[PDB]
C-alpha cells in the first residue's frame, strides 16, 4: 500500500537517516521484541508500514492479562472484534448457562487476519475510547 497516504509525513520518531553518508542500503528501521516468548514476525523487520501502535515497531508495551478469542468482525481500519465464550454456574439449580463478551482489539499490519481465526491478544495502555488490547499471535484455524 501507499505509505505516504496522509496529510502529514509518516516516520518513526528520532530515527535519523543521514543523507551525508548515503550508504547503498535499506532505510534504517527500529524494532524490538515484546518478550514473554512472542516471536517478532519477519514482515515487521522487513516491511515498510508505519504504525505507532504496533507492539514491535511502535511506542506501545505489553503487560497484564493475555487472552484468546475468535475473530467476528474485520470491518474497521486496523481493528477487529473477538468473541469470548464461557459457562456461568448457578448454585440453586446446580447447573450452567452459556454467556459471551465482545472485545475490540488493535491489529498491526504485520498480521493477516480473517473471520474465524483464533487469536492471542495482550493488554496495553488505553489507545482509544474502547480498545485496550493488541494482537500478538495468530493461528489460522
Amino acid at each position: 500500500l501507499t505509505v505516504q497516504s496522509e496529510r502529514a509525513f509518516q516516520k518513526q520518531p528520532h530515527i535519523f537517516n543521514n543523507p551525508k553518508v548515503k550508504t547503498s542500503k535499506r532505510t534504517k528501521r527500529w524494532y524490538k521484541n515484546a518478550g514473554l516468548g512472542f516471536k517478532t514476525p519477519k514482515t515487521a523487520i522487513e516491511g515498510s508500514y508505519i504504525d505507532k501502535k504496533c507492539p514491535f515497531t511502535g511506542l506501545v508495551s505489553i503487560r497484564g492479562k493475555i487472552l484468546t478469542g475468535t475473530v467476528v468482525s474485520t470491518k474497521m481500519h486496523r481493528t477487529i472484534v473477538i468473541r469470548r465464550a464461557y459457562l456461568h454456574y448457578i448454585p440453586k439449580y446446580n447447573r450452567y448457562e452459556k454467556r459471551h463478551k465482545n472485545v475490540p482489539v488493535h491489529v498491526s499490519p504485520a498480521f493477516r487476519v480473517q473471520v474465524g481465526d483464533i487469536v492471542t491478544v495482550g493488554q496495553c495502555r488505553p489507545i482509544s475510547k474502547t480498545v485496550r488490547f493488541n494482537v500478538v499471535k495468530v493461528s489460522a484455524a
Binding site: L87, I90, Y93, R95, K98
Partner: protein, 144 residues
C-alpha cells in the same frame, strides 16, 4: 420424563420458568406490584388515626340476629372514609362525633370478620385513652 429439562447446561430455562410462575402466588404478587401503597386505606401501616363523622348500627348477616354498633371515620393522613366496629357493648357511649380515634385492623388481613358485613377495622383508643381501661373503670375520659 417429568416434562422439565434436566440437561447440565439448562440452567437459564429453569430459572426463567420459575419467575413466570411465581405470579400465581397471591401474596408474592402483592409485594412486587406495591398494592398496599397505591390502595387500601392504611397506606401499609399497622394503625391509623381518624375523626368520627357519625354513629351507625349494622344488621348482622343471617342466620345471626343483632344490630351491631359502628362509626364512620375519616382518616387524617388520607381523607379516606372508613367504617369501624366498637367492641365491648356499652362502650359506644364513650365515643361521640368529632372525637379522635385510633384504629386497628380486625385481625383477618383485610377481610371482614364474622357476622359483620363490610367492616374491616376496630377502635382501640378514643381521645387518647384506651377503651379497655374505660370499660374496666380504670381511667376517666375528659370531654371536649
Amino acid at each position: 420424563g417429568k416434562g422439565k429439562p434436566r440437561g447440565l447446561n439448562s440452567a437459564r430455562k429453569l430459572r426463567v420458568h420459575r419467575r413466570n410462575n411465581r405470579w400465581a402466588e397471591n401474596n408474592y404478587k402483592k409485594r412486587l406490584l406495591g398494592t398496599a401503597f397505591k390502595s387500601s386505606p392504611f397506606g401499609g401501616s399497622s394503625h391509623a388515626k381518624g375523626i368520627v363523622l357519625e354513629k351507625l348500627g349494622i344488621e348482622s348477616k343471617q342466620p345471626n340476629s343483632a344490630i351491631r354498633k359502628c362509626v364512620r371515620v375519616q382518616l387524617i393522613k388520607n381523607g379516606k372514609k372508613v367504617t369501624a366496629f366498637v367492641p365491648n357493648d356499652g362502650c359506644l357511649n364513650f365515643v361521640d362525633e368529632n372525637d379522635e380515634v385510633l384504629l386497628a385492623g380486625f385481625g383477618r388481613k383485610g377481610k371482614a370478620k364474622g357476622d359483620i358485613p363490610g367492616v374491616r377495622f376496630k377502635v382501640v383508643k378514643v381521645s387518647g385513652v384506651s377503651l379497655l381501661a374505660l370499660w374496666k373503670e380504670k381511667k376517666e375520659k375528659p370531654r371536649s
